[PDB]
Amino acid sequence: HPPRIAVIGAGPAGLTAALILHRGGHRVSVYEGEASGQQRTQGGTLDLHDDSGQVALQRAGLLEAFRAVARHEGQEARMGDPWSGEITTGKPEIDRGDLRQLLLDALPADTVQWGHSLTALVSANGHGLRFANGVQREADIVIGADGAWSKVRAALSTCQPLPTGITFFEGWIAQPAADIAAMVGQGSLFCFGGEEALFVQRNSRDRLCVYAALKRSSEWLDAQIAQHGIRTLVTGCYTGWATNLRRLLEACTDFVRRPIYSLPADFCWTPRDGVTLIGDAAHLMPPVGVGVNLAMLDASDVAMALCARPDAISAMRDAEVLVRERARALMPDAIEGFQRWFIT
Ligand SMILES: Cc1cc2nc3c(=O)[nH]c(=O)nc-3n(C[C@H](O)[C@H](O)[C@H](O)COP(=O)(O)OP(=O)(O)OC[C@H]3O[C@@H](n4cnc5c(N)ncnc54)[C@H](O)[C@@H]3O)c2cc1C
Ligand SMILES: [Cl-]
């Protein structure tokens, strides 16, 4: 019988896998924890690399669609001196929500099962899935594309992501003043102040995404935030910075706390027939510019294998080796490199 394929997660990995499987004539459902009204809130910017994200879109028949919608407007990465506030200068881009929309727009209406938050995977008739809403399903193939805190990973491993000692505080400037819009430009502004850093990107709707990155223990942040709240704590950490960069920070309405976790480079799970992990589920690592690109490439490796080969279990097993070998080669530099951003 043609296999019942369950994808857990409607991120870039899960949607990329579902689209390649659908186009290969496979029966695929994606189970997404979030309700449909959740895309269109995410608008951070990213670029798809010619050897990963763009390969995945080509495999899914969407490379030209991506090229039609991408910005090719020569977005430059700028550097800011935290103390002088001086800015210097030294790749097809798409907002995160527009990437997810592109994949959703290419899929049949029924593909994604919204409000299906996986709570258990129970293996051998194949694999049982239980959802927080009480729904039960049975699948022959389960692709874990369920992100940093993958429930599918929790079925295969007791190993958890570890804190990096860095937390990003994410803010938005919906209508930047002329001065801060001109300072950031059309692209990115990166400011490394040691244990404080500031990462700003303009998205396709001329909104600024702000990451206030703090090297602080979770315990210290808990105490300070409990007392002062997020906004006061975040702004308080940059009082030694140039006035121009502090104004950029103070223009943010709210901040969300985004602890930066990573799986360890030595991460392993015992392979299980008919179950695998892709993207952040398989190899969550600090945000050094690989995550969406790897997620989509992983999805395309696994989905192509399931389309090309009649032995589904063996196809998945071979694709998993490639996913894991590729990620293990990148994770040490990602983990150590990220730490070196915050050295003093
Ligand atoms: C602050 C920050 C900045 C980043 N910047 C960049 C960047 O500039 N460039 C870049 O390439 N990457 C960046 N990343 C990394 C990137 O966001 C991720 O690597 C990428 O989104 C992973 O895709 P995915 O499909 O594996 O997982 P996700 O995109 O996390 O998708 C997982 C999906 O699974 C769903 N889900 C979770 N648990 C369940 C469950 N139990 N049942 C059902 N559904 C579930 C979630 O709702 C979600 O839709 C950044 C990350 C952070 C934290
Ligand atoms: Cl990343």
Author numbering: 3 to 92, 102 to 135, 138 to 357
Publication excerpt:
However, the genomes of several strains of this Gram-negative bacterium code for a FAD-dependent monooxygenase (SmTetX) homologous to tetracycline destructases. Activity assays using SmTetX showed its ability to modify oxytetracycline with a catalytic rate comparable to those of other destructases. SmTetX shares its fold with the tetracycline destructase TetX from Bacteroides thetaiotaomicron; however, its active site possesses an aromatic region that is unique in this enzyme family. The tetracycline destructases are classified as class A FAD-dependent monooxygenases (FDOs), which cover numerous proteins with diverse purposes and functions that primarily catalyze the hydroxylation of aromatic substrates.
Nevertheless, the structure of the protein could be solved using molecular replacement and refined at 1.95 Å resolution. The asymmetric unit consists of four SmTetX molecules with pairwise r.m.s.d.s on Cα atoms below 0.34 Å; the substrate-binding site remains structurally unchanged across the individual protein chains. There are two pairs of identical covalent dimers cross-linked via two disulfide bridges, i.e. chains A and B are linked via Cys172(A)–Cys172(B) and Cys281(A)–Cys281(B) disulfide bridges. The crystal structure contains SmTetX in the form of covalent dimers, which are most likely to be artefacts of crystallization. The enzyme shares its fold with the class A FAD-dependent monooxygenases. The overall structure of the monomer is divided into a smaller substrate-binding domain (residues Glu75–Ser99 and Pro176–Tyr274) and a larger FAD-binding domain (Met1–His74, Lys100–Leu175 and Ser275–Pro323), which are stabilized by a long C-terminal α-helix (Asp324–Arg364). FAD is observed in the IN conformation in our structure, i.e. FAD is elongated and its isoalloxazine moiety reaches into the re site. A chloride anion was modelled in the re site near the FAD isoalloxazine moiety according to the signal strength in the 2mF o − DF c map, the typical distances to adjacent atoms and their chemical properties. It is bound at the pyrimidine moiety of isoalloxazine and coordinated by the main-chain N atoms of the Pro300–Val303 loop.
